[PDB]
Design a protein around this nucleic acid. Structure first.
Lengths: 136, 69, 224, 386
RNA sequence: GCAGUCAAGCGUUCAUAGCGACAUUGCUUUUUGAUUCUUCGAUGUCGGCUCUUCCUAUCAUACCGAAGCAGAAUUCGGUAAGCGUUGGAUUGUUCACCCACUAAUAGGGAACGUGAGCUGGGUUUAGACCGUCGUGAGACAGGUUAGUUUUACCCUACUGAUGAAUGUUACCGCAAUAGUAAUUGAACUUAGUACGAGAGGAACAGUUCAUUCGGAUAAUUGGUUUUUGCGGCUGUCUGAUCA
RNA sequence: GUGAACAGCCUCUAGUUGAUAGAAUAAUGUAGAUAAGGGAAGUCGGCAAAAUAGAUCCGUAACUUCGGGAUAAGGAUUGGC
């Protein structure tokens, strides 16, 4: 969810807590992303705010082209690699985590996306679907 | 509701049953149960497990009248 | 003509809608205000169709076609396939395409005469697209981008390309496509032109955030 | 000192004590409000849970993403033998609450009801309902005077019913007697409806209907004595702790000098009475209705019984109610189905949508086949048979 | 630390929209002091983790009033704690400063709550090193490293369970009393409308979801798997095979 | 006997079959374990567990008292006939 995330998303399994490392899915020059927080989280003692498919989070680049480092930058999750249940009755998951760089307004700094993109992310974020590749 | 076929064994999958996995090649993969799903993870050639459907098809196992038009 | 419309709040009209010369598709979750602009000038000339391709509302990117055919991905349900068959006129022939390359709208950038496809297209799918669409297809990428359909908004009267395309690249396609192409932006600086807005032979719909002179350019190139 | 960091309380305060239920059947504490304008019908009902199964139906909710798209849901089919009335009872109003002042019993009560009153059936002489039932030899003034009293007094009438324990494929051999209030009109007409319903069926064709919101009263499955971690959900103590990491560290402050009742302590878990509200029915089937599992779309031939029957339960050959979602209570246990106390208006209820497909696959493992016909067809001939 | 009263003036013009000098009246016992009354035949001394309740000087949520409140945002106040007040880097840290989310990251008490709940990171025996002081043995809120933390088989309190006696026994119910639970946000429409020459810019009603909490289950997905249920493999022993 | 091996594991000679027992086998425990996704975000401190870990071939840096570091780091195979 969050600002600019028009429409709503059905809840799915949370499989990306604070401190996860995610492969860089888009051609922004980065190699991995380090999740520091998630948008629209809760407040409970000793609970890591976790992320999921289609969610937008801010993640630093622990390993990538230099001036993409040492600073916070929001991103959008395109793969989860964690079994989540759709309404249609399927328990599916991806091969690995993947995220795409995106400013808070919702558009993408990158140009293209490599690998499958969950349609729970394409539907929720229109610009991700604009620059998406494989759709599930 | 359409008929989807297991990717490893070949048995029919009913709604609410089975699993689903997406590879890096962006090609779909459906498994009826953890028995077939885990067996795929171990990189098992399904032409060599006896109770699958591709094994019986390969060795005309129990083909009976299916081999005749 | 050129109409300024927002789907809910997003300005990506081309993403949520597919506009052609004899039919047009829109998302079902839209409101009257988004629907009003489409029906303002279309009237009863060509049908308005409400569908959800792939169970989602990005039908503009999940679908691409022209007068002779329509494209839907494999995972779409036959109930929606039957619905579009009944809603759309029989003049268009719908054949399912088996391809995991990408969404068809991003992969396919086609018109009545020419077509642009994704770099990783296979020969088996190449013949299927040509026969269904009745369109000769060529190999080329907009500015080297794989997503040719999302960075090129095109019609029979002209065409839009990636804003930072080299001058040599733009003229090369114009010879094959037989229509001029003009580099530009949409939706107040957005470089996604193929998916930002759509054109048919008698109308082009853009976002409400398009600035003063891009809309003038759109009118000029597309002969509105 | 304060709590440093403040957290929501673990557990609920209104569900205490978490002790064993007084009876194996959860009594109905309240009944839907009565209106003296409608024809006489029952308010609550009795059934036996048999398990769950999977369904597919076309969701119809305008404004949602999944409008006109297929979904899956869990439903708990509850076994239903037709319930036969063996008596009525009147409740009068007092400045101290409703009170029952008289009871009336039927003519020929089945051996099941007689078996209820005996703790030792075999040693007994079966002498129950022998002196009282003989009162019908006369013109009937013995009982007709009582039914006259329930008409005058007892502005509230509850009818005594019981289930058929032999029709259900369960081996208790003893019925469940219970009281069921009525939602008819006029206490004179309520008892009048009771007289001509002694020793006869009351099916699920009148008590409930398709796509109706009902309650589910049952008894929680028991887990015996439990600690404080799993009972409430308390955080597990760190690994380095000496002498136990599955307890609550601080029961309470120095003052007060006694343990508070609001502190979570180890005790009995399960075997509670939980009333789950707003359950929606999808199917109301009859035993004589062949191909219960078939729907208007499948056009198949199969009942709702899965392969090998319900686990720890029989084959199901009589009436049943197929209600959306989970349900309190476990298998082989009596479940009270009761009419909603309030008229639901949420745009989530009132959704008159039929099902599309019903899971009849094996519930004793990885059910791969719905009917023996398709099972024998897919595999073909085996070493057995020909 | 907190709350008033008066009131010169600030506030473009105006004492109280919001502030407010010089003085002055009280409240608080979570600061620190002073006293030394209890306890030196001894009530285990800092902090952190876990957990319950209570109080409010309300941080957010509910309903309202006032503005130098045109909208938005904000600021001041009233009934109100019913509900919610977080995740991390540094430090033993109380404290403090930053990163980030969020509607918000409000203050506190209960023997500075809580060691027969936990830890022993610090201060606090004994080993040892460096700096200053001393002729010296040794001294320092100095700096640093290593440093066994025991018992409930009692009573009460709490959490669950049984039970004699009111002719016996069984079934179905009433009800005093006690407890009580729900919570907040986002997207669309309203709506580029109201409001202002402009930047901007909402709200009641409705729909779809979600955050935290609670109770129940187990079809479905996942976990466990002494059903060693089945198959495979290693070493050794039943002469070999089978087992 | 396997095995580098007085290592571990099974057996021949020899010697025991001994240290309270019976039934269900609740929590909480002591001792072994396994956990989907992330992974030290926990804690004063990865403390406890975990991973590599035998053998053969290739390959090995900074520095140095030139003797070492060094099985550094990092790769490829292992059964049976």
């Amino acid at each position: 969810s969050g600002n600019g995330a028009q429409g709503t998303k059905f809840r799915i399994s949370l499989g990306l807590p604070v401190g996860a490392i995610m492969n860089c899915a888009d051609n922004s020059g980065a190699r991995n992303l380090y999740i520091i927080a998630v948008k629209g989280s809760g407040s409970r003692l000793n609970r890591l705010p976790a992320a999921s498919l289609g969610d937008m989070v801010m993640a630093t680049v622990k390993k990538g082209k230099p001036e993409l480092r040492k600073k916070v930058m929001p991103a959008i999750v395109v793969r989860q690699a964690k079994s989540w249940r759709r309404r249609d009755g399927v328990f599916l998951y991806f091969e690995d985590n993947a995220g795409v760089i995106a400013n808070p307004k919702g558009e993408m700094k990158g140009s293209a996306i490599t690998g499958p993109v969950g349609k729970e992310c394409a539907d929720l974020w229109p610009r991700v679907a604009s620059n998406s590749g494989v759709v599930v | 509701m359409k008929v989807e076929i297991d990717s490893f064994s070949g048995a029919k999958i009913y709604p609410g049953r089975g699993t689903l996995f997406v590879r890096g090649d962006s090609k779909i993969f459906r498994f009826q149960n953890s028995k077939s799903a885990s067996l795929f993870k171990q990189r098992k050639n399904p032409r060599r497990i006896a109770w699958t459907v591709l094994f019986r098809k390969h060795h005309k196992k129990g083909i009976t009248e299916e081999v005749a038009k | 003509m050129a109409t300024r419309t927002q789907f809910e709040n997003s300005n990506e009209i081309g993403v949520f809608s597919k506009l052609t010369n004899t039919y047009c598709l829109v998302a079902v979750g839209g409101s009257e205000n988004f629907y009003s602009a489409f029906e303002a000038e279309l009237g009863d000339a060509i049908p308005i169709v409400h569908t959800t391709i792939a169970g989602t509302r990005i039908i503009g990117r999940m679908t691409a076609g022209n007068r002779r055919g329509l494209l839907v991905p494999t995972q779409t349900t036959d109930q929606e396939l039957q619905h579009l068959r009944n809603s759309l006129p029989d003049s268009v022939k719908i054949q399912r395409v088996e391809e995991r390359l990408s969404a068809l709208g991003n992969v396919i950038c086609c018109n009545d005469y020419v077509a642009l496809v994704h770099p990783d297209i296979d020969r088996e799918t190449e013949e299927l697209i040509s026969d269904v669409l009745g369109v000769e297809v060529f190999r080329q990428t907009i500015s080297g981008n794989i997503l040719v359909g999302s960075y090129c908004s095109l019609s029979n009267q002209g065409g839009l390309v990636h804003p930072q395309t080299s001058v040599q690249d733009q003229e090369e396609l114009s010879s094959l496509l037989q229509v001029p192409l003009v580099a530009g932006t949409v939706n107040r600086g957005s470089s996604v032109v193929g998916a930002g807005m759509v054109v048919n032979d008698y109308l082009a719909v853009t976002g409400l955030d398009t600035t003063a002179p891009e809309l003038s350019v759109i009118e000029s190139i597309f002969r509105l | 000192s304060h709590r440093k960091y403040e957290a929501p309380r673990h557990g609920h305060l209104g569900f205490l004590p978490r002790k064993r239920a007084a009876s194996i059947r959860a009594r109905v504490k309240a009944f839907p409000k009565d209106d003296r304008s409608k024809p006489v019908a029952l308010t609550s009902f009795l059934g036996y849970k048999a398990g769950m199964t999977t369904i597919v139906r076309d969701l119809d909710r305008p404004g949602s993403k999944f409008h006109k798209r297929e979904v899956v849901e869990a439903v708990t089919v509850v076994d239903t033998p037709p319930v036969v009335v063996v008596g009525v009872v009147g409740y009068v109003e007092t400045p101290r609450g409703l009170r029952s002042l008289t009871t009336v019993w039927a003519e020929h009560l089945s051996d099941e009801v007689k078996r209820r009153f005996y703790k030792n059936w075999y040693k007994s002489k079966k002498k129950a309902f022998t002196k009282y039932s003989a009162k019908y030899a006369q013109d009937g003034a013995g009982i007709e005077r009582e039914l006259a009293r329930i008409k005058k007094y007892a502005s509230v009438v509850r009818v005594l019913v019981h289930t058929q324990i032999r029709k259900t494929p369960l081996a208790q051999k003893k019925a469940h007697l219970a009281e069921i209030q009525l939602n008819g009109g006029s206490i004179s007409e309520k008892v009048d409806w009771a007289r001509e319903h002694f020793e006869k069926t009351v099916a699920v064709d009148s008590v409930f209907e398709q796509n109706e919101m009902i309650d589910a009263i049952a008894v929680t499955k028991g887990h015996g004595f439990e600690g404080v971690t799993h009972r409430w959900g308390t955080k597990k103590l760190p690994r380095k702790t000496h002498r136990g990491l599955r307890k609550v560290a601080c029961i309470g402050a120095w003052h007060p000098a006694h343990v508070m009742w609001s502190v979570a302590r180890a005790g009995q878990r399960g075997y509670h009475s939980r009333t789950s509200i707003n359950h929606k029915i999808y199917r109301v089937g009859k035993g004589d209705d062949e191909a219960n599992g078939a729907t208007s779309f499948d056009r198949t031939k199969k009942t709702i019984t899965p392969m090998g029957g319900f686990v720890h339960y029989g084959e199901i050959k009589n009436d049943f109610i197929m209600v959306k979602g989970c349900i309190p209570g476990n298998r082989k246990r009596i479940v009270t189905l009761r009419k909603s106390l309030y008229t639901n208006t949420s745009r989530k209820a009132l959704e008159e949508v039929s099902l599309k497909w019903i899971d009849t696959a094996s519930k004793f493992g990885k059910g791969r086949f719905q009917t023996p016909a398709e099972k024998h067809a897919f595999m073909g001939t085996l070493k057995k048979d020909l």
